[PDB]
């Protein structure tokens, strides 16, 4: 099929993926009660230490 789009239709080759919806997490609580520590990493934006003013 790769030969087709290059040779035949003068086209670039579309590639696709399968995307399942990002998992559902409840509205974050100011004081998570009785929760595993890792609770915090659930709502983590991305993984990187971010030193705001430092």
């Amino acid at each position: 099929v790769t030969r087709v789009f290059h040779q035949l239709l003068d086209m670039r080759e579309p590639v696709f993926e399968f995307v399942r919806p990002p998992p559902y997490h409840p509205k974050q609580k100011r004081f998570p009660h009785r929760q595993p520590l890792r609770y915090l990493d659930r709502y983590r934006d991305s993984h990187e230490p971010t030193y705001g003013i430092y």
Binding site: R30, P32, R34, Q35, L37, Y43, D45
Partner: protein
């Protein structure tokens, strides 16, 4: 709590708070779950998991704890290697 010391006039701290908790800089207080070293064989693997955890304390408990704790444990801390430094800030919190 000792709200005024004898010799310094300052506000003392409870030590037995400190030995068993940890304060993040967000204000979240962290603790062990009680009885985790206690009667293991008698317990289901599930429970054992639930116990070996570290957990968070609700607002009431936290405020309480703060009162028994001076400034010095509320200060910001950068430890080399700190397992918990990853955790200290709040992210994406919209209230």
């Amino acid at each position: 709590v000792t709200y005024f010391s004898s010799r310094k006039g300052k506000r003392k701290t409870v030590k037995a708070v400190i030995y068993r908790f940890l304060r993040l800089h967000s204000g979240l207080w962290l603790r062990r779950k009680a009885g985790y070293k206690k009667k293991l064989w008698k317990k289901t693997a599930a429970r054992k998991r639930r116990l070996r955890e570290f957990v968070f304390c609700n607002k009431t408990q936290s405020k309480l704890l703060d009162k028994m704790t001076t400034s010095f444990w509320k200060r910001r801390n950068w430890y080399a290697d700190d397992p918990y430094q990853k955790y200290q800030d709040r992210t994406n919190l919209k209230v």
